[PDB]
Design an enzyme around this catalytic site. Sequence first.
Site, PDB file in Angstrom:
ATOM      1  N   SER A 321     -20.231 -24.529  15.856  1.00  0.00           N
ATOM      2  CA  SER A 321     -21.266 -24.169  16.828  1.00  0.00           C
ATOM      3  C   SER A 321     -21.805 -25.392  17.610  1.00  0.00           C
ATOM      4  O   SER A 321     -20.993 -26.175  18.097  1.00  0.00           O
ATOM      5  CB  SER A 321     -22.371 -23.363  16.153  1.00  0.00           C
ATOM      6  N   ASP A 597     -17.675 -17.573  16.636  1.00  0.00           N
ATOM      7  CA  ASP A 597     -18.507 -18.655  16.086  1.00  0.00           C
ATOM      8  C   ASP A 597     -18.751 -18.406  14.595  1.00  0.00           C
ATOM      9  O   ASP A 597     -19.070 -17.287  14.223  1.00  0.00           O
ATOM     10  CB  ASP A 597     -19.816 -18.654  16.892  1.00  0.00           C
TER      11      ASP A 597
END
EC number: 3.1.1.4
Length: 757
Positions: A321, A597
């Site tokens: 991330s 993600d």
Amino acid sequence: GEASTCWQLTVRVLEARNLRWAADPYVILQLSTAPGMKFKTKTLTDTSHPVWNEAFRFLIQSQVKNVLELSIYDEDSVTEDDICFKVLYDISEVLPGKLLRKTFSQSPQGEEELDVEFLMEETSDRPENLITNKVIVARELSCLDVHLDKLELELVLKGSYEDTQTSFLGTASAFRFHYMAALETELSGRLRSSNSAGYLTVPLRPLTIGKEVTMDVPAPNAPGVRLQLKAEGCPEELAVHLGFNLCAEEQAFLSRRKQVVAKALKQALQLDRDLQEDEVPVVGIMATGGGARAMTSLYGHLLALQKLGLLDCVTYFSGISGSTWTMAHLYGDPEWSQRDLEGPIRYAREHLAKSKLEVFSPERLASYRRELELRAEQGHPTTFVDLWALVLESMLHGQVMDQKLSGQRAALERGQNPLPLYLSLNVKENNLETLDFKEWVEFSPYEVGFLKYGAFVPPELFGSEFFMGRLMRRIPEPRICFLEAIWSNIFSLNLLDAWYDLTSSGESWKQHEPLTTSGTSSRLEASWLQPGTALAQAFKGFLTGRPLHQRSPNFLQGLQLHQDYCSHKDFSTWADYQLDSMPSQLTPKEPRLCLVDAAYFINTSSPSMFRPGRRLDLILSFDYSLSAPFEALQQTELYCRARGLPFPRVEPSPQDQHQPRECHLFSDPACPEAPILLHFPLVNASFKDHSAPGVQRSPAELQGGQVDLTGATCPYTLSNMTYKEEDFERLLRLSDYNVQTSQGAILQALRTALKHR
């Protein structure tokens, strides 16, 4: 490289009983390892108890998992045919020579039945040339070329990757089909125009030798057209790397890096002698997610390690991330860890400070549109990830940043930086069952691939089209912002919620910090993200239809599962039990991936620290959560324990949870195999008082230690992309301080890591 012989399977579909009324039933047979080859019985009329008595023949490779699908459909000329029966059957039960009679039943009380008989027999063919890592199998591939001396030519080769290829005369010169050597199939050819000419067929027998045919394809109201075709063995070289150990480039990097580490360790620990290669401990940095907060804080952590001379002791650097933004920016400079980090810090600070409303100028918005229009014409899909890539790029750099993941290899050529590892999860898209099916996909400058399947490609080839491990169509490697967008695509979901009042059809919800002054979530509140912006005005409508996640071509496409893939140490480590015991439902057979993600599931970059061969001795764990600083570490521990991966207990005391400190040690000296963990939660503890390790602060400089991590108006919330330089510096300096003040603990852990090795 492996030679293995095929068997012949005869499947005799006898009859079915107790089928549901409209039936006009027919049976379909599909084999998981022969995509595009369907067999179909005759359709019977108004029976409910059909008797077909038809037999069909497959060539079966014993070394792969073979799942036979038997489906009964109800024929209707008006609507698409309804399925009234389906069974999946692992044919490994059928032993050669012994006829096996089977009656398949639907449900425990289900009354529907299908009678089938199976006979497996030996053949006199040569063995098939397979390539495996014992979980994924590359089947032997044949290649067939068709050359040609208005009309449309249609070429069909059932079971091939291409399947069907059409072209007008003059407009197409040559054709290539790729298909498994083990198939019994054919190439059919014909000419069509707006009386229809006859088609020609050339049989393609299993495991044949190369051949060369010329035939004249008849035209309607015109003379024959001469085609020349030659079938040949495809070369036995793969673009996809199959293996569960580190690739040659990473091994070479390790030798280079360990020299730099040995030196830096001697200096840092003031060691008597020079370290032997085998004594050099493998040290990793592991960063979690948290948008710009994670990005900023990680810069500070890296600055600390540099100043302490301990960055040169680090071999691996993993992130997810927002942490990947720091990594990507730094690894654009091949010398980043050897240069003053204050430069990149300043760059990041200035871009994080600028107005994110004025960044979306008309010129900029037009550029986004123009780029997305070109991409579409080039054949790329358009998703939220694509827009997020361009917007994120604009926020981080204010311009097109023409750097690529493959270019990061330059940062590793002299072992002068740690190896960067970026993580994402492959998920099943738009499937309400299989919600928690998830596969780790690791990215590095050397290779991108699946930890579970032991299958990787160079980053420059990620996003290209593949079949059976061969490169079918090379797509240019994208700009790094497109990978950053995947790695941090939690923001695609935040953009979707902030923009679209989803009280609607789209059930791609996924739907996963200090509350606001209003007592509401801080998640969807930042200037750039709000529904009335220039950005939203230009693109809200444009994006309406579109998927959240990139639809990346699957580099595993067409590869098959090994017969004993389940009982392999590394596949078993990563296997999601129930779905993974279903080999026909695994990823190799998908044309596409859906990459997400890691923050959608678990806020850790740790899986890369446990790839076989890496052998981590010490991990510096940096955690950027604003609440629950041990949550990520604890979930990872449970995750590791479930899979038999050695990892220390993470048992912070009640006091530790009440008030976490700058550094926590998690280590199990009873198990040397397990790595040592030094965990750095995001906390403002001793930094409130001290401007430097062991240094109290002037009352004038009291403001510098007032880091707003907890109330409303916390400026470090996930979606905030605008930091006042004031707020940037506090978070950065806090992070720097927290590591510097822990110097003693780090050196101690390094000494212990050294002893263990």
